[PDB]
Design an enzyme around this catalytic site. Structure first.
Site, mmCIF file in Angstrom:
data_model
loop_
_atom_site.group_PDB
_atom_site.id
_atom_site.type_symbol
_atom_site.label_atom_id
_atom_site.label_comp_id
_atom_site.label_asym_id
_atom_site.label_seq_id
_atom_site.Cartn_x
_atom_site.Cartn_y
_atom_site.Cartn_z
ATOM 1 N N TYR A 272 -19.122 20.094 29.369
ATOM 2 C CA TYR A 272 -17.803 20.253 28.781
ATOM 3 C C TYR A 272 -17.831 19.959 27.276
ATOM 4 O O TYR A 272 -17.335 20.758 26.495
ATOM 5 C CB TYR A 272 -16.760 19.372 29.465
ATOM 6 C CG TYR A 272 -15.416 19.420 28.796
ATOM 7 C CD1 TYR A 272 -14.586 20.536 28.932
ATOM 8 C CD2 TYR A 272 -14.980 18.374 28.008
ATOM 9 C CE1 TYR A 272 -13.350 20.579 28.312
ATOM 10 C CE2 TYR A 272 -13.757 18.411 27.378
ATOM 11 C CZ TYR A 272 -12.948 19.512 27.531
ATOM 12 O OH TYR A 272 -11.744 19.518 26.895
ATOM 13 N N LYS B 284 -17.116 22.333 23.930
ATOM 14 C CA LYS B 284 -16.125 21.980 22.920
ATOM 15 C C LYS B 284 -16.736 21.788 21.537
ATOM 16 O O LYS B 284 -16.159 22.245 20.555
ATOM 17 C CB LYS B 284 -15.274 20.776 23.365
ATOM 18 C CG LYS B 284 -14.404 21.121 24.567
ATOM 19 C CD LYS B 284 -13.393 22.196 24.197
ATOM 20 C CE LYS B 284 -12.483 22.573 25.335
ATOM 21 N NZ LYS B 284 -11.562 23.636 24.870
HETATM 22 C C1 LIG Z 1 -14.636 8.917 27.757
HETATM 23 C C2 LIG Z 1 -13.160 8.493 27.763
HETATM 24 C C3 LIG Z 1 -12.525 8.861 29.101
HETATM 25 C C4 LIG Z 1 -12.302 10.380 29.224
HETATM 26 C C5 LIG Z 1 -11.547 10.980 28.016
HETATM 27 C C6 LIG Z 1 -11.335 12.473 28.071
HETATM 28 C C7 LIG Z 1 -11.275 13.225 29.260
HETATM 29 C C8 LIG Z 1 -11.034 14.605 29.232
HETATM 30 C C9 LIG Z 1 -10.831 15.268 28.021
HETATM 31 O O1 LIG Z 1 -10.601 16.604 27.994
HETATM 32 C C10 LIG Z 1 -10.860 14.585 26.820
HETATM 33 C C11 LIG Z 1 -11.093 13.213 26.798
HETATM 34 C C12 LIG Z 1 -11.123 12.538 25.450
HETATM 35 C C13 LIG Z 1 -11.315 11.023 25.490
HETATM 36 C C14 LIG Z 1 -12.157 10.549 26.669
HETATM 37 C C15 LIG Z 1 -12.272 9.032 26.650
HETATM 38 C C16 LIG Z 1 -12.752 8.324 25.383
HETATM 39 C C17 LIG Z 1 -12.982 6.885 25.835
HETATM 40 C C18 LIG Z 1 -13.149 7.045 27.327
HETATM 41 O O2 LIG Z 1 -13.273 6.093 28.062
#
Ligand SMILES: C[C@]12CC[C@@H]3c4ccc(O)cc4CC[C@H]3[C@@H]1CCC2=O
Ligand SMILES: NC(=O)c1ccc[n+]([C@@H]2O[C@H](COP(=O)([O-])OP(=O)(O)OC[C@H]3O[C@@H](n4cnc5c(N)ncnc54)[C@H](OP(=O)(O)O)[C@@H]3O)[C@@H](O)[C@H]2O)c1
Ligand SMILES: NC(=O)c1ccc[n+]([C@@H]2O[C@H](COP(=O)([O-])OP(=O)(O)OC[C@H]3O[C@@H](n4cnc5c(N)ncnc54)[C@H](OP(=O)(O)O)[C@@H]3O)[C@@H](O)[C@H]2O)c1
Ligand SMILES: C[C@]12CC[C@@H]3c4ccc(O)cc4CC[C@H]3[C@@H]1CCC2=O
Lengths: 278, 278
Positions: free
Chosen positions: B155, B159
């Protein structure tokens, strides 16, 4: 017990030079599987291997086409040692042209070889490293994975994709004992014009040949010796705590600093348009 | 005349909400072509449109499957005005899991839809915008295209790929007067455990279930409504001088700055591992 290295894309360029650098190393600590899309292209490799006096048994060639997971799997089976200590994902394609002049098949191939092909390699070889708790993975990166380059839209898409793939993996791998590093290269010494004109507008057609003039100039000025580039891979392997990125040159870190001061992204767009098109 | 807007992925989510937000605008400034992978799924779009009393002729639906250049071409030809003023490339897939547990066909499909699909859109619609010397393109991005996210390797790859594609094009497009913008979203509201273990390893298994728990919490705290996201698109398309990126949220700025302070990637990998895994 030698360090077993498997490298993709060894017929030319960075892969060829890294393979023979490792296999010829005075310590004789590396056993190198140099893999090629088509074994018929192995002549230059063997010529270079002889020139550096690679010892008998330090270098072997395998067919490995990263588009085909059966080809990946059969190459893994040919590693007689039954393990890989260092995996180098280096195979890659370029694609140069106005976006709308690029064939749909060319676009898909670049993604399949550069991105999906690296995925196939990691799927085949990462598990055993993770289980063992050791292993190094080096991925050939590009300045074009860090900043956008005109008329390289799809190439840049694929190199950016590798940054995202590798960085995501590095976050998980941090405490596994398995170390992934991108080696960020600038330029390195290693359709027809009817078609281009038919498939784009006249202004783009002009800008494309303007770009090709500016690109030849920069390449003459900035193209690195492949030996110098290969040695950065070696430095990343020597490191007991390797970083996620290594840069083969500082030439573009100013652009990278500037780019990342501006979260809106438009300062870079302006600067790079001026650098390329005057 | 009205501003002609064509949007992909309008069956649900951001695409649906933006389509009906523009079509229901009191000034009636927008003519909206809302496109869907499969026209049969358009029921919810029309219910939302009728709920806001979108006037007749403000909203039209077309089938457009971004995997098929013939579908893209057939949709382009149905635009009766013969121009698109705002193109919104919003069609996208997610893919979550340990890299080595993902099917190669699923990996390939994500890159084909998210990356190649966007290329197909740009190949078909940019030429007319370049020729007439005006046009806006908005692309659904992610903070996962700017920083790597564990277990979202593919993913994130996709992106990041859109970042590189769009940035490269933006350098070329400056003097054509065609403007490209990424809308960088955070999270948005919309196998069996033994299979995961068998395909991975003991460490990966633990980290995956830790990740899932932590992710569930972040979605609860941080996930935005598609309507809020649609509003950022509206700002971008109304900007007199639109920038390369618009952010739907500032929540991830800290981790993003952590990343850009240290180009080696060390500070980011450490910080993100701590954020996700505690
Ligand atoms: C990895 C994450 C959870 C999953 C989030 C996530 C999940 C799906 C998505 O389309 C975008 C994002 C952006 C932030 C992501 C988080 C940043 C810190 C964290 O704990
Ligand atoms: O080094 P550089 O930056 O200077 O560039 P370069 O010399 O063009 O190196 C690219 C390498 O990647 C290889 N490659 C391309 N497609 C491949 C595939 N499907 N499977 C495996 N390897 C592939 C190339 O072999 P081919 O040139 O034979 O594709 C070549 O050996
Ligand atoms: O919430 P969110 O908006 O972030 O996510 P979301 O609601 O899942 O939005 C993704 C959109 O992209 C579309 N899409 C997926 N594959 C496609 C294809 N090949 N061609 C055209 N559209 C496609 C989806 O349609 P489908 O769900 O119908 O595939 C959906 O409308
Ligand atoms: C676009 C570029 C010229 C072409 C270079 C080029 C050429 C070939 C290649 O495989 C990689 C690169 C990366 C850097 C590129 C330059 C950055 C600044 C500039 O003007």
């Amino acid at each position: 017990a030698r360090t077993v290295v498997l490298i993709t894309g060894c017929s030319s360029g960075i892969g060829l030079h890294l393979a023979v650098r490792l296999a010829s190393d005075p310590s004789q600590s590396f056993k190198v599987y140099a893999t090629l899309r088509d074994l018929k292209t192995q002549g230059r490799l063997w010529e270079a291997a002889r020139a550096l006096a690679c010892p008998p048994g330090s270098l072997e060639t395998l067919q490995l086409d990263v588009r085909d997971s059966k080809s990946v799997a059969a190459a893994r089976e040919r590693v007689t040692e039954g393990r890989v200590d260092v995996l180098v994902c280096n195979a890659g394609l370029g694609l140069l042209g106005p976006l709308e002049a690029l064939g749909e098949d060319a676009v898909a191939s670049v993604l399949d070889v550069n991105v999906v092909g690296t995925v196939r390699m990691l799927q085949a070889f990462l598990p055993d490293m993770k289980r063992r708790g050791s292993g190094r993975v080096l991925v050939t990166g590009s300045v074009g994975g860090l900043m956008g380059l005109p008329f390289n839209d799809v190439y840049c898409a694929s190199k950016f994709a590798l940054e995202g793939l590798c960085e995501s993996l590095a976050v998980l791998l941090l405490p596994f004992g398995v170390h992934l590093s991108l080696i960020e290269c600038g330029p390195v010494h290693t359709g027809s014009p009817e078609e281009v004109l038919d498939r784009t507008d006249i202004h783009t057609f002009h800008r494309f040949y303007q770009y090709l003039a500016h690109s030849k100039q920069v390449f003459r000025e900035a193209a690195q010796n492949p030996e110098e580039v290969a040695e950065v891979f070696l430095t990343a392997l020597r490191a007991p705590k390797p970083t996620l990125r290594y840069f083969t040159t500082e030439r573009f870190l100013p652009l990278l600093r500037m780019r990342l001061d501006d979260p809106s992204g438009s300062n870079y767009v302006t600067a790079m348009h001026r650098e390329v098109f005057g």
